[PDB]
Amino acid sequence: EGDILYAMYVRQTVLKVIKFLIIIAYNSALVSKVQFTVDCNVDIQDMTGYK
Amino acid sequence: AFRVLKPWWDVFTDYLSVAMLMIGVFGCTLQVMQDKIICLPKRVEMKGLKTDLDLQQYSFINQMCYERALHWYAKYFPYLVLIHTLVFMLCSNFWFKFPGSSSKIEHFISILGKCFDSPWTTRALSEQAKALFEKVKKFRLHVEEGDILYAMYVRQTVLKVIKFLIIIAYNSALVSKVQFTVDCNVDIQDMTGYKNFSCNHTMAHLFSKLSFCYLCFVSIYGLTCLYTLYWLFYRSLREYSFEYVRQETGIDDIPDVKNDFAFMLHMIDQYDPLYSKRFAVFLSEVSENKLKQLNLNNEWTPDKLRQKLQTNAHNRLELPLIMLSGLPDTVFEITELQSLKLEIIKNVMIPATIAQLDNLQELCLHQCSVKIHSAALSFLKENLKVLSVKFDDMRELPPWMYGLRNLEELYLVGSLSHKNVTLESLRDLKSLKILSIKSNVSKIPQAVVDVSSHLQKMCVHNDGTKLVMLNNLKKMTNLTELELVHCDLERIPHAVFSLLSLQELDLKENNLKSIEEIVSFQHLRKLTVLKLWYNSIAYIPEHIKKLTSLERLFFSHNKVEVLPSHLFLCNKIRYLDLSYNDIRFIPPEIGVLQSLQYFSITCNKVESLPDELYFCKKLKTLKIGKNSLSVLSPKIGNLLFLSYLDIKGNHFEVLPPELGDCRALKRARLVVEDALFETLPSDVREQMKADA
């Protein structure tokens, strides 16, 4: 008289699939974002004299 | 005890509390480790901007602006979160950490686990749980008077809700307060030469992000409470009605539960739907009755019942029952018993298994409230012949006994008047032949008139109640034997004169003084037996000579001093009871009583015995008893048929050897003094005791 456990397992599997899909989708684009070197221009002039 | 008390929302709240505690500890660790404020003076090809300030001044400025500019909530956020999480954990765990309700919780857990563990629950649905029913009822009586635990839990939930509301309300505004960069203008000029400073601390952005996620957790936490709060205020968990166990298992017991009990039942059902079903069984009283029945079946075996089988008073195989809680089924296995005896056995139900006991005709009941089955009642109607019932306050009297047509003899031991006797009509008793009543009947009930068409023997022996109304006794035409013991009439009633079929008459303890009604007894020519026990009779009327049918005479324990000669005119009398009277001399006319076989004058003042007394050669029972006889006549040797002699308590000096002529009288039937027996010759005493 159960069968709810099967639905629970299906929901868990679906959640895992969705999480993996989102992970791949955004990590693929975000990995290329990072760089070793970087440049920053902030209003540190008149604070340290450089920007 | 530690696991079955957690509903799903409670588990989620516990997990959220653990996560928030971890967040607070992590925040405190990072605040101790890396939370440092860096400050610089604010207002000033681009070259360097040396401030010619030493490290000590830098540290001083960092401390100063950290105390000044940085927001108090921003600095206290880790400790704040830690404190809130600790308070939530404390208010969650105080439910079980409070011993006053913890004792009740532990007792409930133990009893529920034990009841679920018992396989007898499943057996009843389809051993030592019998004593566990006592703990079950103890708990149900003790803890239904509580409901304070429900209020405690409600207060804890309310406190959690209020804390969550306050947390959201102030954190929502306070989160936006924090900033990564900051400015402070303190009076450090003329101390460090600067006033305006721009500063920042590392954790800010991270803290911001962290705080955001923290808020989300709290939000869910609050939502959880709401659901529970709604579940607290939508179902009204103070009362729980099963309405399913009763419908399925078909048990009308276990009606409802109190506030505390319904609360705990709801909590367990939400934790597990089947634990409540398994635990509800021991609340049932019918289940307790059946478990006691099983325990009795284990206790009782047919061997024990057959051991207790014996012979009753009225020559039947009887199984006396003296203290039982019901009817063991093994009793129905033993059909050889003809009588059954019950003593002080309440709440008895007789099933159709009584039909197994075919050879049953007598039943004895002593203070037993018993009900029958339809098949049981029919079997009793068609098979029983004798019935004995003892009841004290009429509550043990089964009404269906008035419907037994084939009953022949009935015995009643219990007051009926408590004036009229509380007796139902005896119409269905179509075969009643002998009736015995031990009650306080003052006027004869009409019910007996409904049975007189075939009634032959009616006995009423009251404990002193006067039979004031004798109207119905005249209706006992078919009555052949009548006994009225202690009916306190003080005279011979006129009703007995209306019974021509009477044969034996008893008037024990009727205190008769004037017995001049013997002439009325002349209308009865079948009066073979007449009894006058325990009366104040001092004179024997001459009319007693006219009772031709007299065969037995009883006058023991009366005021008779001088017995008339004409008393011996009834030559057909075989039993003559004259003991415990004031008799001093026996008239010689007793010699004409040749048919006499019994004579007892014990505890009288008899001083001499006439020789004609020895002429009654048919005398087989001579009870002289304690009298004033000083010598024994040799003529006693003539009574070759004499079987019993009782002369103890007299003034005898030497017993004549003629006592050896009594063949039927032995030493066992000889009641004499030791010296009197020893005065006999050796041959006589040897022949009396043995065959030499």
Side-chain angles (χ1 to χ4, degrees), chain B residues 467-485:
Chain B
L467 202 47
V468 284
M469 288 184 175
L470 310 133
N471 216 18
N472 307 333
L473 182 55
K474 300 177 185 177
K475 300 291 187 179
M476 320 301 174
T477 303
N478 301 81
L479 196 69
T480 62
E481 308 163 29
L482 178 62
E483 298 190 0
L484 307 179
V485 175

Side-chain angles (χ1 to χ4, degrees), chain B residues 174-193:
Chain B
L174 288 184
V175 163
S176 59
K177 168 63 182 179
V178 308
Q179 305 292 342
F180 184 86
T181 65
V182 74
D183 194 319
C184 36
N185 287 27
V186 204
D187 192 8
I188 338 179
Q189 191 177 14
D190 313 331
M191 306 296 312
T192 59

Side-chain angles (χ1 to χ4, degrees), chain A residues 45-50, chain B residues 41-42 46-49:
Chain A
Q45 192 176 15
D46 309 329
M47 298 296 311
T48 62
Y50 300 84
Chain B
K42 184 263 175 183
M46 54 302 181
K47 304 175 183 181
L49 199 53

Side-chain angles (χ1 to χ4, degrees), chain B residues 585-621:
Chain B
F585 297 105
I586 302 299
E589 289 76 12
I590 194 181
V592 314
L593 303 177
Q594 190 69 18
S595 62
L596 196 70
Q597 301 186 359
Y598 182 92
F599 194 68
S600 182
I601 48 176
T602 78
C603 288
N604 299 350
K605 310 192 64 179
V606 182
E607 305 172 350
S608 296
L609 291 187
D611 294 356
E612 293 77 11
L613 174 61
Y614 310 102
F615 289 163
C616 314
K617 300 184 181 303
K618 302 180 184 178
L619 276 176
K620 306 189 61 178
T621 308

Side-chain angles (χ1 to χ4, degrees), chain B residues 484 486 490-492 506-513 515 531-538 554-560 580-581:
Chain B
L484 307 179
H486 210 357
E490 304 286 334
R491 293 292 184 90
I492 306 181
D506 191 2
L507 299 174
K508 178 178 181 180
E509 295 188 356
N510 239 335
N511 316 13
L512 258 54
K513 173 188 294 183
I515 56 184
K531 308 170 187 175
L532 298 170
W533 292 70
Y534 296 164
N535 291 335
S536 299
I537 291 169
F554 298 79
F555 273 97
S556 59
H557 307 75
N558 285 261
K559 313 304 176 299
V560 188
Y580 290 73
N581 299 329

Side-chain angles (χ1 to χ4, degrees), chain B residues 54 82 88 106 126 212 220 237 320 365 383 437 439 462 474 484 501 524-525 571 591 600 692:
Chain B
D54 54 61
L82 189 269
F88 267 147
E106 191 264 3
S126 304
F212 194 80
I220 287 182
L237 313 166
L365 306 177
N383 296 124
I437 303 180
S439 302
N462 28 11
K474 300 177 185 177
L484 307 179
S501 303
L524 315 179
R525 295 304 171 183
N571 57 335
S600 182

Side-chain angles (χ1 to χ4, degrees), chain A residues 32-46:
Chain A
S32 59
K33 170 65 175 186
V34 309
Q35 305 292 340
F36 183 84
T37 65
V38 74
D39 194 319
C40 35
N41 288 29
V42 208
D43 188 9
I44 335 179
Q45 192 176 15
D46 309 329

